[PDB]
Amino acid sequence: QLVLAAKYIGAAIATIGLTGAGIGIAIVFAALINGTSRNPSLRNTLFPFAILGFALSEATGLFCLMISFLLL
Amino acid sequence: LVLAAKYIGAAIATIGLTGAGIGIAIVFAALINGTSRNPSLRNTLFPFAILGFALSEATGLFCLMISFLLLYG
Amino acid sequence: QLVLAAKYIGAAIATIGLTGAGIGIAIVFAALINGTSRNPSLRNTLFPFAILGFALSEATGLFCLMISFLL
Amino acid sequence: MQLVLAAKYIGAAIATIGLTGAGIGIAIVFAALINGTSRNPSLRNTLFPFAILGFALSEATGLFCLMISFLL
Amino acid sequence: MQLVLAAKYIGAAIATIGLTGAGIGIAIVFAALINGTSRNPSLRNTLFPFAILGFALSEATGLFCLMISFLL
Amino acid sequence: GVAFEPSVFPSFSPISIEESPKLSEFELEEDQAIPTSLSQISLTNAILNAMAEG
Amino acid sequence: IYIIGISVSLWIGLTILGLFLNKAVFFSLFVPSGTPLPLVPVLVLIELLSYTARAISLGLRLAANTLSGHLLMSILGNLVKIFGLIPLAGIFAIVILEFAIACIQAYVFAILTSSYLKDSIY
Amino acid sequence: KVSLVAPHQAIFTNKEVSQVNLPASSGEMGVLANHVPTVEELAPGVVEVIESSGTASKYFVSGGFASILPGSKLSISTVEAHPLDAFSSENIKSLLAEAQKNASSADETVAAEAAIEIEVLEALQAAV
Amino acid sequence: ILLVTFLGFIALISKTVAPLYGEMAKNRTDHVVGLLNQARADHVNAVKTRI
Q1: D38 in contact with H at a CB cutoff of 8 Å?
Q2: F19 contacts on B by Cβ (under 8 Å)
Q3: How far apart are CA A50 and CA A43, in angstroms?
Q4: What are phi and psi of B29, to 5 degrees?
Q5: How many whole angstroms separate alpha carbon B25 and alpha carbon A10?
Q6: Contacts of C66 (CB under 8 A, 6+ apart)
Q7: Angle of CA points G3, I5, C53, to nearest 5°
Q8: B2, containing H or E segment
Q9: Contact G93 B62 (CB under 8 A)
Q10: Biggest CA pair distance of chain G
Q11: Cα–Cα distances in Å, from D7 out to C64, D12, E8, G101?
């Protein structure tokens, strides 16, 4: 009754954190695409910071999704 | 009423993930654009990115502890 | 059971203020990292304003977290 | 009074959502002052009076929202 | 009354969400005045008169929204 | 105003004007030609000064 | 430590408001700046009102720092029940940030009192 | 303190100025006292340097580079610097009509040079 | 956390001991170099005045 109905709401409001993880991959890609045309950060250099920075920003979406799947 | 409120405590508290997710991309955008201006590569800008990311990620770790404590304790 | 149910939700809705404190710590560090490469704000100078400016933005998240953990 | 006690705990949670404007307001004035002090000119005057007075005005919204939350 | 007392606490908490616009408004005018004064030479005049008059207009939204919260 | 001496003046190219130490201290637009335009303008300015002094 | 921090911070906030009122008895000259309208009297959220908000930052920082350090009891039961070496690195970073926060909080309190002393003599 | 020196004569030379509303590459900017170091290029506009009071000289500059040093020194280095009274209104209309007819009528650099000359002649005629 | 705090503070105290001794060369040890330079300049001025 009360415990069964609260399980569906535990995964709905917890999915609101996808706006930060979704826009984080685009903010790091916008600075890397505009900065690569300034010559000549291509191989490594700027590619290492963009690959490592995208994994740290994507950790918020994976951690928030674990609490939604555990209650649904 | 006590068991139904515990499940909603771990969902509404996850709204703070937008600040922690966008904070890691805001610090990485300024470091990637500043490194291409010659020549903040070794240390300098690279060392401040590791220490600067810990301050922005502290809000996400502290907010996640209050949501996980309501479902286990 | 009405008083115990409102105590669990008091610490969840109050955690929405972490978006301003989380993005505020990165906004002050983004301007200091881009300005240090213009020569030559390194030792002190810009280091004192970044350390003191980060404490003012972190005061909003520290005061809001005390009211949620007091339930 | 079960209805009066339930509304007291909810009053301190929804009122704490205003910390996003006060937290980001102190960082917006510090970001523009740090990027302007590196060139023309110093940082002990001129912009020093505006940063101290500007931070106190933006922090007034956080004190008013926290007073109504602790009194309910 | 139980229903009248429960709506009074929720009205003061929902009205406090408007502090994000008033808090960020005082910082937006202070960020442009700190960076604009470094380009010479509007410091004690010109830009000083618009910063005092502009901050009073943005602060009117916070005072009007806080009056309905304390009266409910 | 009686004697002279043979001097020399160097001219930087487009690849050496943008690779300076404090070249990013001024507000230069990265979209338009700023490195190639300032390098080619120094050759015509130095040629006029050398021809007038010569 | 929590009750002693709020009581000691309240005495320091009242001394800042009393010192500014005593020095204004021989100079006064208001405290705000002139403009083209007359709505500076309603915005009295500073000076006297700013002392209560500045003194509350010391008590709020002590409650948030104590709540982070007291959270090790809930994490110790899960690590003694992935590898448990992740809790040692996170506790060391939180202890270093809590100890360094005392120097930033003390410098912010001294910077707020310096603006009140310079404005009272001008 | 201005150093508006051209490639034939010196206008400001010594530091004895205050304001300088010279047209740069972006917009109609104006140097005040100790401005920031902005070494941007100059376009063909009106370089009116306000000397203390209202003693501004409308110098019709044809473009150059307005270099701003860090020690409150504005070196507006342009190619030409003529006053507003040194341009007759009768001869100014003949140059704008010939540049408009020659534009978009040939090839090579004939159409490119005529398009840039029509924009500089229209801005100088409206500021007379 | 008590054993991890003692091990971390021991490494930070070792690096701070070399930093405190190095920073004192521009204040504590610099006073001996400044007094020796002032005494050498005063001895040359006293020998020139006596000559």
Answers
A1: no
A2: 38
A3: 12
A4: -75, -40
A5: 27
A6: G60, G63, G64, G67
A7: 60
A8: helix B2-12
A9: no
A10: 70
A11: 18, 9, 8, 35
CA E14/CA D7 separation, integer angstroms:
12
Residue of H1, H18, H35, H50 to mutate, interface with E, max E Cβ within 10 Å: H35
> Pick from H7, H25, H38: which is nearest to F26 by CB?
H38
**CB H37, CB F25: distance < 8 Å:** yes
For residue C41 the two structure tokens come to 């704000």
Q: Which amino acid is at F13?
A: S
Give, rounded to a whole angstrom, the gap between the first and last alpha carbons of chain C. 15
The two tokens of residue E30 are 């202070």
At A48, list the tokens. 């290492």
CB contact under 8 A, F19 and B38: yes
Please check whether residue H112 is in contact with residue H94, taking contact to mean a CB–CB distance below 8 angstroms. Answer: no
Resolution of this model in Å is: 7.8
Cα E58 to Cα E31: distance, rounded to the nearest angstrom? 14
Q: Token pair for residue A24?
A: 């984080």
Structure tokens at G104: 């930033």
Q: What is the largest CA-CA distance in chain H?
A: 50
Tokens of D38: 């590196």
- Looking at the complex, report in whole angstroms how far the Cα of residue G100 sits from the nearest Cα belonging to chain B: 12
User: CB H5: neighbour CB atoms within 10 A?
Assistant: 16
For chain F, give the number of residues.
54
Please name the residue that has the structure tokens 């000397």: H51
CA–CA gap between residue D54 and residue H106 (Å, rounded): 60
Inter-chain residue contact D17 with C17, CB threshold 8 Å: yes
Sequence-distant (6+) residues with CB within 8 A of G95 are: G69, I1, I5
Closest CA to G12 of G41, G40, G39, G52: G52
- Token pair belonging to E47: 């830009």
Alpha-carbon radius of gyration of chain B: 18
Amino acid at G66: T
Experimental approach was cryo-EM
Closest CA to H69 of H102, H36, H97: H36
Q: How far apart are CA E47 and CA E34, in angstroms?
A: 10
Neighbour count for residue B59 (Cβ, 10 Å):
29
User: Which chain B residues are closer than 8 Å to C15 by Cβ?
Assistant: 12-13, 15-16, 63, 66-67
- For residues G120 and G20, the answer to whether their CB atoms sit within 8 Å is yes
Q: Which residues pair with H31 in a beta bridge?
A: H20
